């Protein structure tokens, strides 16, 4: 037979998963869920190699059976559950909140988040579908179909999502002052306020976005995420602040200590 494949070779794992060479041959293939396999990461390596909490798949499974892990204030027991691009994960008894963001290196990293900020989550809608009854739903990158969005919300606009009540709060457009962040570009991890949009006739829309340090770089419209307006990032950015310090001067900063 030639059905759906249910194995992932360790060398075939996505680069940002970061599985070693000698630590086996099979990588934990994320179960079907809300996000892609290539750009999302599973609880196994999130809790084993990123948090360094455990040491063995048996012990990783020993943790999740106790309902001491929560994502979007929702309990998940699926061991190979794709977390998503950015979410709200929560472990109860230690009273801590991790949010998943990007690195200047272009990776997935847990990020310390307070309770009030963890109550705040964002979703980028992928398309709007209107069903019977002239009602509208938007499907987000989170694999969520949120119905009855504001009429002003468009296909590229993003929506503040209140995870507990499961409702939209505030829309964010794609203006020249719309501060965004790169998701799947070769310039992953760079936070920017966009400079201009370069619409092209029927092909992927490449847009130029402007960095804080006055660097302009372009990426497709498909891998942008509006994470706030020009005022400030709505989400607490990681230590690197989303500013791609150049590879040349990274070395002098590491040399000085």
């Amino acid at each position: 037979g030639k059905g759906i494949k249910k194995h992932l070779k360790r060398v075939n794992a996505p680069s940002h998963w970061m599985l070693n060479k000698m630590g086996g041959q099979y990588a934990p293939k994320t179960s079907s869920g809300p996000h892609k396999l290539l750009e999302s990461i599973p609880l196994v390596i999130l809790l084993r190699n990123r948090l360094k909490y455990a040491l063995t798949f048996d012990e990783v499974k020993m943790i999740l059976i106790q309902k001491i892990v929560k994502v979007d204030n929702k309990v998940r027991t699926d061991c190979t559950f794709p977390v998503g691009l950015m979410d709200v994960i929560h472990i109860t008894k230690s009273n801590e909140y991790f949010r998943l963001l990007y690195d200047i290196k272009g990776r997935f990293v847990p990020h310390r988040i307070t309770n009030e900020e963890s109550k705040y989550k964002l979703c980028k809608v992928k398309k709007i579908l209107l069903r019977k009854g002239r009602l509208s739903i938007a499907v987000t990158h989170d694999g969520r179909s949120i119905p009855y969005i504001h009429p002003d919300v468009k296909v590229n606009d993003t929506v503040r999502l209140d995870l507990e009540t499961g409702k939209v709060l505030e829309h964010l457009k794609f203006q020249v002052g719309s501060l965004v962040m790169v998701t799947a570009g070769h310039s992953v991890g760079r936070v920017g306020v966009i400079s201009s949009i370069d619409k092209n006739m029927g092909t992927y829309d490449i847009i130029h976005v402007k960095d804080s340090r006055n660097k302009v770089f372009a990426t497709r419209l498909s891998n942008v995420f509006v994470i706030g307006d020009n005022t400030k990032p709505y989400i607490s950015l990681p230590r690197e602040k989303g500013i791609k310090l150049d590879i040349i001067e990274e070395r002098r900063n590491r040399l000085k200590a």
């Binding site: 060398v11 060479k21 000698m22 590879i247 040349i248 070395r251 040399l255």
Partner: protein, 125 residues
């Protein structure tokens, strides 16, 4: 099913192995350094020729090149960490111009010899 341990060689055979000038030169150097066999005094030229070709790549690149002034200090930090030459040298030409016995000089066999301990290089080894 395959061990992912990448493995490589360290010495390349000289080719034309019967030239008396080079044979006498390598015998002179192995006698001044008290070494074991020709694998050792063929590995060192492999190393210094590797870094030499690496540097010669940078010399072909023009000044102010983002690639030139990346490996210019990437290599130079390693050279000054090993201590091939003093502080009076800073230039890529100056690191291009290295010889073989100065590369042997960093070996631990004769560092103890020059710091004492043994009155012979064979004794130190």
């Amino acid at each position: 099913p395959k061990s992912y341990r990448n493995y490589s060689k360290t010495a390349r055979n000289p080719k034309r192995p019967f030239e008396k000038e080079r044979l006498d030169q390598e015998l002179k150097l192995i006698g001044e350094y008290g070494l074991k066999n020709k694998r050792e005094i063929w590995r060192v030229q492999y190393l210094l020729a590797k870094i030499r070709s690496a540097a010669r790549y940078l010399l072909t690149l023009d000044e102010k090149s983002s690639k030139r002034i990346f490996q210019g200090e990437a290599l130079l930090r390693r050279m000054v960490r090993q201590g091939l030459l003093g502080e009076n040298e800073e230039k890529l030409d100056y690191v291009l111009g290295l010889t073989l016995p100065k590369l042997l000089e960093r070996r631990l066999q004769t560092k103890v010899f020059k710091l004492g301990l043994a009155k012979s290089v064979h004794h130190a080894r």
